[PDB]
Amino acid sequence: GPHSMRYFETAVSRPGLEEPRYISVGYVDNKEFVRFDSDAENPRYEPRAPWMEQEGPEYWERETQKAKGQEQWFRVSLRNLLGYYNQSAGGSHTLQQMSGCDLGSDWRLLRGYLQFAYEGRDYIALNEDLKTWTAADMAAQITRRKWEQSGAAEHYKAYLEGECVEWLHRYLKNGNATLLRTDSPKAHVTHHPRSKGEVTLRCWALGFYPADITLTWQLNGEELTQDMELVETRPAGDGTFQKWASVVVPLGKEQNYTCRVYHEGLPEPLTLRWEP
């Protein structure tokens, strides 16, 4: 399938003679691979995947150095934002950034991303064409005007099209199969008697990876996406994930109902009925 790299950056300002906390997290194929936190003992970029040991100290020098600069950038930006929004000293404020790469399975660039959020709301984003900006708020306009003035998009476009892609290419061969992992789900349904002639059928999927998955309940080929319950997919803590989905039906007629589970690492969907 396709591949991706992202860096998720955050700066959080809190009231004081304090400095904002700057946190930067790297991801290759959605899996955290490097990380830098400004509240660290010894502020630096640490590996988070074993295959990143391969990189020598020179890499870590550059990247953490690169981090300290971003840290400044966020600090200044954070102050400007306070102006732009007419917010008065003593606030808790947050500034976020996602940027990176998508590759198809030909390792050919598919799309670059660059977007910012203030207070957890879209603030400005590079458009797919990688030369125009979308700005949400009125306050974002002045950034846009300014960045259109300085031709910022050309700076990012160079990065998104060049380095981001190459380094991802580099990480991909060092990560290799490691991040090709799938663990398929295991599924069962638990049978829960209700009042009123009912039973709650709960369809479980456990120990799967990646997190993406879909579970559905079917009455007679028809798909009851209709008043079933889901939970947000959850981490087990061990690298795998879990989810469940329930329907309420008349017990005795449990063969009528069927759960299906869809996941990359399945040769094909799982079909399962409650087993007496």
Binding site: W73, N80, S150, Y156
Partner: peptide, 9 residues
Amino acid sequence: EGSRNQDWL
């Protein structure tokens, strides 16, 4: 590898 932002916001 991380990017270097250009002009501030």
